[PDB]
Each structure stands twice: as C-alpha cells, then as structure tokens.
Write a protein that binds this ligand. Structure first.
Ligand SMILES: C=Cc1ncccc1CC(=O)N1CCC[C@H](C(N)=O)C1
Ligand SMILES: [Zn+2]
Length: 139
C-alpha cells in the first residue's frame, strides 16, 4: 500500500483505489495503473522533474529502502492478475530488486524528489509507475 500527496491530489495504484478515491476522481489510466483523487487537506511531497535513472525505493515486505538502477519509462508486458488481463502497461520503469504484491504504492525517489510508485514485480524485477511527466500535479 501507499500514496503520493502533492497539493490537493493523492496518487495511488489504480488497482488499489478506494470508494472515496473514485468519488473524488481527478484522473485515471488503466494502462499506467494510476489514479489521482482530490483531497481537502494539502500534501507536501516534491515531484521530481528530471531524467534520473538511479534512486531509492521503499520495500514494505522487508521494511527497508533500496538503491536501484531503473530503465526509462516505457511499454512493458505485464502478466494477468485479478485486476487486469495480460497487457502492456505504459510509463513503466524496471529495476533488479525484491517486491511482493503488498509492496505496490511504495515510493521511488531520486535527489530531485518522488519519481513514481511500485506497481509490478516478479522474477526479481520490480516495476515502477512514473509520475514525473504529470506536470499538472504541481500547478
Ligand atoms: C508488484 C507486485 C508484485 N511483486 C511481485 C510479485 C507479484 C506482484 C503482483 C504484480 O506485479 N501485479 C499485481 C497487481 C497489479 C499489477 C499491475 N500493475 O498490473 C501487477
Ligand atoms: Zn531526479
């Protein structure tokens, strides 16, 4: 589990969105496994606006942060789950690292700020959903 809070927005994995998230829907995209909802209270996370390929991610199944090298955001084939059929998920970044299903939502961050959140995993490869191109999260 886990989310990003910047201004009046909450960024979660789409497959983990709540009834309150859908009742206050700003934007959602199944191909990216992303959902943004609106908040009464103000968030104070900083979103990275960069092309970094190294960073640290939080892994709840180990209660640890790990340094990783990741690929640039791209279209990557993801296996079928109870939330989606087998498909290409867009804006996905891969890293060699540990993850489990309950690890989705954990933040990946570089020296510039939040880059994205854990979204996929398997075969000792962890996939992150990029949020750096969503320029409207600040404005
Ligand atoms: C990411 C957790 C994970 N890690 C290791 C093993 C298995 C998983 C589960 C996983 O990858 N997904 C199930 C939830 C939906 C995801 C998606 N974006 O399509 C895919
Ligand atoms: Zn950066």
């Amino acid at each position: 589990s886990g989310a990003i809070y910047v201004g009046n927005y909450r960024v979660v994995n789409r497959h983990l969105a709540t009834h309150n998230d859908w009742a206050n829907l700003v934007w959602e995209d199944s191909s990216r496994d992303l959902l943004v909802s609106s908040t009464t209270a103000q968030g104070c996370d900083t979103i990275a606006r960069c092309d970094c390929q190294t960073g640290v991610y939080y892994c709840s199944s180990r209660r640890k942060h790990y340094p990783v090298s990741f690929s640039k955001p791209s279209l990557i084939f993801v296996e079928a789950s109870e939330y989606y059929p087998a498909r290409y998920q867009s804006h996905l970044m891969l890293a060699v690292g540990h993850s489990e299903p309950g690890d989705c939502g954990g933040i990946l961050r570089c020296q510039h700020g939040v880059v994205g959140i854990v979204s996929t995993g398997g075969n000792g490869l962890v996939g992150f959903a990029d949020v750096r191109d969503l320029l409207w999260l600040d404005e």
